[PDB]
Amino acid sequence: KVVKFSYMWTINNFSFCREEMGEVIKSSTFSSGANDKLKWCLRVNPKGLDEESKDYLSLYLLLVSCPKEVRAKFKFSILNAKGEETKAMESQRAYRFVQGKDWGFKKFIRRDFLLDEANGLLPDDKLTLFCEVSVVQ
Amino acid sequence: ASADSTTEGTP
Ligand SMILES: [Cl-]
Ligand SMILES: [Zn+2]
Ligand SMILES: [Zn+2]
Ligand SMILES: [Zn+2]
Ligand SMILES: [Zn+2]
Ligand SMILES: [Zn+2]
């Protein structure tokens, strides 16, 4: 049966400079509970890692631990300055995860949408991402 | 929106 859980990731000192931020950044690990040993993390490319996504921030869900079979649906959103879910993007189906496999969206959010202060998505250079994971595995 | 992966296949 599906087990649904979530993780809120606050990235501090956010910068679009690859030489300061890194090409890839990763969150701490999370799971559905203290008893759940399957560990996940989020991975962000502050600038998309291919030509197609270069004007985007790319966001992925990564299975970190070695599962004892695993499939999961996922939904990513950005939390605004008021704390609300904005710019949600979700998988249409569950995908197969093995240790080290990621799934996500290379064009999750346009960089210039984040740099537009009216949207309130980078207050104090903190980017707050929220992931909801549905593991049917 | 269709999901992508940074790697080809599993795996
Ligand atoms: Cl999808
Ligand atoms: Zn720099
Ligand atoms: Zn730079
Ligand atoms: Zn540079
Ligand atoms: Zn299975
Ligand atoms: Zn939600």
Side-chain angles (χ1 to χ4, degrees), chain A residues 2-36 38-67 69-136, chain B:
Chain A
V2 281
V3 172
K4 196 168 188 171
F5 57 103
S6 67
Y7 183 71
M8 188 192 82
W9 184 20
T10 301
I11 301 164
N12 301 287
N13 301 324
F14 193 91
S15 152
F16 283 103
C17 186
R18 300 226 294 259
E19 288 73 22
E20 294 167 58
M21 201 63 194
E23 179 170 75
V24 178
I25 52 181
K26 285 179 182 176
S27 72
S28 300
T29 53
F30 63 94
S31 70
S32 62
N35 290 318
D36 183 358
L38 252 194
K39 310 280 201 183
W40 301 85
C41 74
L42 301 181
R43 166 219 165 125
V44 158
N45 311 322
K47 315 178 107 164
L49 267 207
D50 66 17
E51 179 74 17
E52 197 183 352
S53 55
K54 67 183 187 189
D55 299 328
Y56 291 78
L57 178 143
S58 306
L59 174 53
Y60 295 90
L61 176 62
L62 174 65
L63 181 62
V64 165
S65 66
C66 193
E69 214 176 59
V70 180
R71 282 182 300 153
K73 309 185 85 264
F74 48 87
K75 169 178 165 178
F76 306 126
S77 58
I78 309 164
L79 306 187
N80 68 9
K82 297 106 153 196
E84 314 152 16
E85 273 175 37
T86 71
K87 308 293 295 188
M89 197 170 283
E90 78 181 297
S91 66
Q92 292 173 32
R93 62 196 55 93
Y95 290 91
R96 166 84 63 233
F97 283 86
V98 293
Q99 191 184 46
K101 180 67 168 178
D102 65 41
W103 284 104
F105 302 103
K106 63 155 86 178
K107 317 206 299 206
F108 169 62
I109 189 65
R110 274 206 84 90
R111 165 167 69 253
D112 284 345
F113 194 91
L114 291 176
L115 289 167
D116 183 13
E117 310 190 70
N119 298 313
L121 299 190
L122 279 181
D124 205 9
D125 298 327
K126 301 189 190 299
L127 178 63
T128 299
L129 300 173
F130 188 63
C131 175
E132 298 164 58
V133 186
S134 294
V135 194
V136 41
Chain B
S2 276
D4 66 285
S5 179
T6 70
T7 59
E8 288 176 294
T10 267

